[PDB]
Amino acid sequence: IDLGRVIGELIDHRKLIISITSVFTLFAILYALLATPIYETDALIQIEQSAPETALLQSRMILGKTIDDLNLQIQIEQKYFPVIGRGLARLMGEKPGNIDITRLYLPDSDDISNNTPSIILTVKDKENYSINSDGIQLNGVVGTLLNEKGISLLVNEIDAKPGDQFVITQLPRLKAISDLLKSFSVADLGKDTGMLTLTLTGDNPKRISHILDSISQNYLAQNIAVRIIDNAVTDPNPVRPKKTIIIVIGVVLGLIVSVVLVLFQVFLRRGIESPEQLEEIGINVYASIPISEWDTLLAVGNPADLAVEAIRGLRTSLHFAMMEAKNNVLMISGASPSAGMTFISSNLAATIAITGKKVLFIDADLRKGYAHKMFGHKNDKGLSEFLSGQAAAEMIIDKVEGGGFDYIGRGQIPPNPAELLMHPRFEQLLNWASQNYDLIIIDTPPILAVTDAAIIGRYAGTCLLVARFEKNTVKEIDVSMKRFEQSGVVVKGCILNGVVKKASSYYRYGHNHYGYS
Amino acid sequence: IDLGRVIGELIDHRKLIISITSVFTLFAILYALLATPIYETDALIQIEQSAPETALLQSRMILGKTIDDLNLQIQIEQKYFPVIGRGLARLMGEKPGNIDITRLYLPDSDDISNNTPSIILTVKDKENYSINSDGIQLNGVVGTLLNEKGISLLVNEIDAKPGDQFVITQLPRLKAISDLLKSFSVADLGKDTGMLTLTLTGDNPKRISHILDSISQNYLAQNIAVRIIDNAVTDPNPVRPKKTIIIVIGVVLGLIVSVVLVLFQVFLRRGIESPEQLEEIGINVYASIPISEWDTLLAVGNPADLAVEAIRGLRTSLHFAMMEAKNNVLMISGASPSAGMTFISSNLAATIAITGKKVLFIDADLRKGYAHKMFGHKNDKGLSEFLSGQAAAEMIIDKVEGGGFDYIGRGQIPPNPAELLMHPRFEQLLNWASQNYDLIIIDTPPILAVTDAAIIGRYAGTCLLVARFEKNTVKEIDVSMKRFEQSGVVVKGCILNGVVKKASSYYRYGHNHYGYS
Amino acid sequence: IDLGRVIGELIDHRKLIISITSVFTLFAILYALLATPIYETDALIQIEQSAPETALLQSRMILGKTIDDLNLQIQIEQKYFPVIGRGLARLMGEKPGNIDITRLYLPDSDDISNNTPSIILTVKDKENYSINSDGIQLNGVVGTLLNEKGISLLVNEIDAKPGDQFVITQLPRLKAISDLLKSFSVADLGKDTGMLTLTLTGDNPKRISHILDSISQNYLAQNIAVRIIDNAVTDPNPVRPKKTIIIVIGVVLGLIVSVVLVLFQVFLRRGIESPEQLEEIGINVYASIPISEWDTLLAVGNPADLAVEAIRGLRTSLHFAMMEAKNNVLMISGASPSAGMTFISSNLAATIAITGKKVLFIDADLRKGYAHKMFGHKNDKGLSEFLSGQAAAEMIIDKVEGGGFDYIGRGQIPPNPAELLMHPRFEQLLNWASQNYDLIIIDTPPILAVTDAAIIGRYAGTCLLVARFEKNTVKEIDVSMKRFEQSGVVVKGCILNGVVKKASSYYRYGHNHYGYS
Ligand SMILES: Nc1ncnc2c1ncn2[C@@H]1O[C@H](COP(=O)(O)OP(=O)(O)O)[C@@H](O)[C@H]1O
Ligand SMILES: Nc1ncnc2c1ncn2[C@@H]1O[C@H](COP(=O)(O)OP(=O)(O)O)[C@@H](O)[C@H]1O
Ligand SMILES: Nc1ncnc2c1ncn2[C@@H]1O[C@H](COP(=O)(O)OP(=O)(O)O)[C@@H](O)[C@H]1O
Ligand SMILES: [Mg+2]
Ligand SMILES: [Mg+2]
Ligand SMILES: [Mg+2]
């Protein structure tokens, strides 16, 4: 590997890299724009030590005095059904509603798990409201207290629009103190001075300042039975979330994920990349057919296609490689199915037929052949019917419409194709056709699947394999050629099919293909 | 080894990896859901030092004062017979019962080992209960004290359902103090301040808070003859077990166990993996027969099987490898038993017989041959009977029903098979059959077990070995071929049998097999 | 790589390096000359400790006392519409205007985001002024206070020219204190002494000194209910921006950017650099044609060109390489389009024609040939018309005007050029022309694009490829030559075209070209 290789691999997978990075950045931006802002307030306390004073400030005594003073055991949250409703409501510019409660006494279910009883309050107007705990609907009025169904509730100054819902929870005193202690910190700022820097974070900028003022005043009143230099004020800029660092982390995470995925794909790739890989082993590659992006013959629908140009190059190579051959029969086979054998055989027959030569195309794939469908057919009396003795050599030959060559179809699918192909009638047909045609092209099944290609290849002067660009492997093609040669069939060379242009291929070998029109 | 190799090995053993990891995670989840939760309580003590105060708090004086005050030498546990009954009862939502005892005096057996006398109390109703120490049944009533059989017991406020059992133990005072000291810790929290952070853990959230309050009050009363800032309250969230870390440890442990097992299997694997291993040594592999998942011939029951397709490929290879041979006799042997010699020989005979050729199948395994069973037989007058002189060459030949070839069975098992096979009658039979049949296939025992294959191979023009996919070894096959060649028998090649597709094999060599139907 | 290579690469890309470095230095100089200068003032405070005194100086108490004393919650900035207007106005020598405000009360919109109400004040003369907040125009007079539209404003001593605009912002008290605290620092200077070094930075040298004096006096008056040794004076030399370090950083950044870009281009370069690269593979390079910077023939317009001299060298090489050839037909082809095939063929024909020989130039590029345009033409009856049977060999040959050789044009573009070139009429034409001309030069399309060159090359005794200097690749040329040789065409050698002189090429190989006139 080198700089050219890595740059080419990054250019090839650019769509994957961009998509993954964009998804990660979109998630990061959504989180940074929908997360609830958290504000911070601070105060300054002067001590005439401070090491016992920190633990006395963070003690349940002071914190619970604050909880009782400010009624922090009553928890009120506006109801947004999804996990993004609050964020989108804040983004839409809707101000958050709030209600003032000074008295709340729930029936204290106190079951095994739900230690915090909760109700839902729905606002009907500026004055009245509705309450439902477990489906039990009640109606209340601001001002007058409610004592019904074992529930005591006092709501004042509803500041919201009608239809809003609020979840009212009565959490235990220790839970409230634990929350306050989790959001409250004390420092010394000099490690020796009497200055104490109290800090408190929360999602309500006014409430956190009120809470910190209450804490400071309670501590002062306790200690005088300590000077407050700065009363608590809230920094208007939220301390969390940190949007820029969140987005940067998202970008970097997306980039590293994309890079590792690309590396895994590159290292797990095993297919053929260029004809040079085949020619290292000693396999002559006679053509490289590109992918045609255009049941019709390509060489007839679009004679000016790049794939048909590559097939004409293959025809020119064959006109020289097929001389000094024992006969005029050419067999095209391959390693794996759907490698391009029928495509290449049919289009090669078309391109050789337009040059004024008589061509016969035999579809000796007695299992899954569709040449009759691709050419327009009379399905009766095919190769199977001829081989099984129930047809003559003259009634099986047809004419391609937009072609210019004859063809023989597979007929009906037999139960014994490999035993049919061993009959001497096949060699009789080939010997008869070699005297009436200038070229016979035989299409065969793969060799790594069945043995029909190796049975047929005995009567074929020239045999070529078709290798798929990314699917097949060099070892696979070597295995196919050695299995052919083990049965007495000499494979002339190979044909790489379905080639596409890649930047890594350019930085390793080169272009090796152009357009000229 | 490389990335492709390791990924293939992980993919192959994925069932083992998943099973082991799932078992480990299931055990971890069961432990984390059935373990008893352990709560924690804490208090704050202010000292006007604290280094002698820690050791005075953790002293037997204070701890035993607490034990005597709270009657902690009476141990009560609800009876759950299994080691998971308590956990499953807690999961099922059953509240744990408890009883209040203020007086307990067991007869104090005080034997060599059982220093803690214990009894079992069974609840009958809200008022009465039953007591049995060593089978001695007694009945008691809440309120009135019991003084019978040297046992004094006072039970108040039974809060449980009838049928519950409780193990009541009177552990010694030092044992109670040791337990309390094990569950009790003191810290300074400033290393210089007068603040002390007392901590106590246990499985009863109310009891641990009561115990810590008693400890604090006893220490205060002792010291005044120290300020208590925070009385003990229990954190409702248990501190143990830590479910998430337990589950993560379980997952990681399962993964590492699976990986090490996979590595051991990979490094201890010795069998053949591909025909390339055999061809490195110079052994021509003529076929690779896959495992057929479908006493019948495969080539007759399922002629369209993948194994029968591979056997047809072998037939095509043999039609070319068996030319220029001294005669038309083919001997199939192998290295080890149950390698596939009879399977391959019989199916090869069937596939060569369907092509209109006359085939004779001789079962020259005079020890454990079952070809007659597989073909349908007249067990009389087999090869043994012919060789021992008590039969003619015409009465030993039979007909396969769904075959199309003749066969000769082994007859009765002789006591001297290797000495029977050395008789000139065997060569006479082969010479006679070579004039009446187009092909003779001889099935033989292994060569690493007996010498019959090497005796027979003298009269066979072509000899092929059958190697099992994972069982046999390259060295084993080389030993077999050299033992054959040492006795004057030239082995043409090999046949790999029982091949299966593996991801490691793909990432090392390739597919090398396909389906086409 | 070595010193010669790196020096040559730096010399080649000197224009890029200089341009990038100059752009970076220009940006750095513009920033350092347009950034607003920031001045610094300092004072000395003596303490009779100082560790609590630092935090008491930097406290909201003292800072807010200063804010209230100096009315620092009224923010006034002169209006410059661009982000460089202030800098360019300072550079132009314009003194910055200022206004004195002692009373400002905006209606306090206090919306969701814009917590700082702001207005714009436009100066009409030394006395009057205009005010517009959101389009509401008001007129005021220095002296008399304004109480209109809920806005209270008092402006004194307007010192500016008419037409100036000022943005007047009433930022909140905490924001003002935060700004002052951000620009204010305290140190001890001895870590033990009572000396305190107060510092304050800002863009107004007089205002920052006044602010620091107010801070010092407020702290003194608070502490006496501390000695001021040095009252605050402003250092006239701004502390920021640091112009020299900014410019040096710009220079170094430009240099490193240029170097990394040059390294990337060098490592991603893949084209041919010298004939030695081709001759390593075994390809005889017969010429190297330089770029001609001078629809006309070069060999006729400028016969004394360096490119025409290189073509005469090629002619001298050909007069020796074309002996012992089967005929007098020369085919010039190449790997990729726009490599120089038509240029080289036409100019070579001209240079061989001026030596008194009869030359025929055939334009066998039946797809995109423009030789008729380059020579002056009668477009009728070209090579296509001859090959398609509708013309004679005598009506297709024309005369080049400023040439001295005949030529055959492509005629009309046919739909089947490759099938036309396979007609025996082409060989008949070549055989006829080889008896009437001393040399035939055939121009062909590329070979990596189409197969026409490989069809034609059968009848050509000598074939040469044209390689482009930087565009084509050694692997590309090897692929072209092997594709030619695979179709039975023997390529004699290569011709490097479009060569330019480079310092890296000199320090690797040498000059290899000179001028002599
Ligand atoms: N270079 C190619 N460009 C476009 N289509 C192709 C190409 N090669 C094969 N195909 C098409 O993809 C399908 C599979 O190829 P096919 O030749 O039919 O399989 P097989 O070789 O096993 O007989 C076919 O529909 C074929 O037309
Ligand atoms: N590729 C295979 N697929 C399915 N079954 C097989 C295969 N090879 C062997 N067997 C079966 O496994 C058993 C053992 O093989 P066998 O040929 O009888 O042993 P041996 O070679 O020693 O005579 C047999 O029942 C056989 O049918
Ligand atoms: N060494 C060169 N100096 C100046 N111009 C050149 C040189 N080589 C090619 N060209 C000009 O650049 C253009 C492309 O070259 P051309 O020979 O026409 O392409 P092709 O080889 O594919 O037929 C032409 O206009 C040509 O005149
Ligand atoms: Mg096909
Ligand atoms: Mg057997
Ligand atoms: Mg051209």
Author numbering:
A (entry chain A), B (entry chain H), C (entry chain B): 17 to 64, 85 to 261, 409 to 477, 494 to 716
Wording from the paper:
Wzc, an integral cytoplasmic membrane tyrosine autokinase protein serves as the master regulator of the biosynthesis and export of many bacterial capsular polysaccharides and exopolysaccharides. Wzc comprises a large periplasmic domain, two transmembrane helices and a C-terminal cytoplasmic kinase domain with a tyrosine-rich tail. Wzc regulates polymerisation functions through cycling the formation and dissociation of an octameric complex, driven by changes in the phosphorylation status of the tyrosine-rich tail. E. coli Wzc serves a model for a wider family of polysaccharide co-polymerases.
Here, we report the characterisation of the structures WzcK540M2YE (Y718E, Y717E), WzcK540M3YE (Y718E, Y717E and Y715E) and WzcK540M3YE_N711Y (an additional N711Y mutation) corresponding to different phosphorylation states. When Y715 occupies the active site (1pY), Y713 is bound in the same pocket. The structural and MD data reported here confirm this hypothesis, showing that the tyrosine most stably positioned at the active site is the one immediately N-terminal to the phosphotyrosine (or the engineered Tyr-to-Glu mutation). We show that it is binding of the i-2 tyrosine to the tyrosine pocket (where i is the number of the residue positioned at the kinase active site) orders the tail between the tyrosine at the active site and helix α23. The presence of the negatively charged E675 in the tyrosine pocket we suggest is incompatible with binding a negatively charged phosphorylated tyrosine (or glutamic acid side chain). During the progressive phosphorylation sequence, the kinase domain is a rigid body. Structural alignment of the kinase domains of monomers of the full-length protein reveals increasing tilting of the transmembrane and periplasmic regions. When the octamer is viewed from the periplasm to the cytoplasm, progressive phosphorylation results in a clockwise rotation of transmembrane and periplasmic regions relative to the kinase ring. The movement of helix α1 is directly transmitted to transmembrane helix α2 and then to the periplasmic domain and, in this way, the phosphorylation signal from the cytoplasm is coupled to the periplasm.
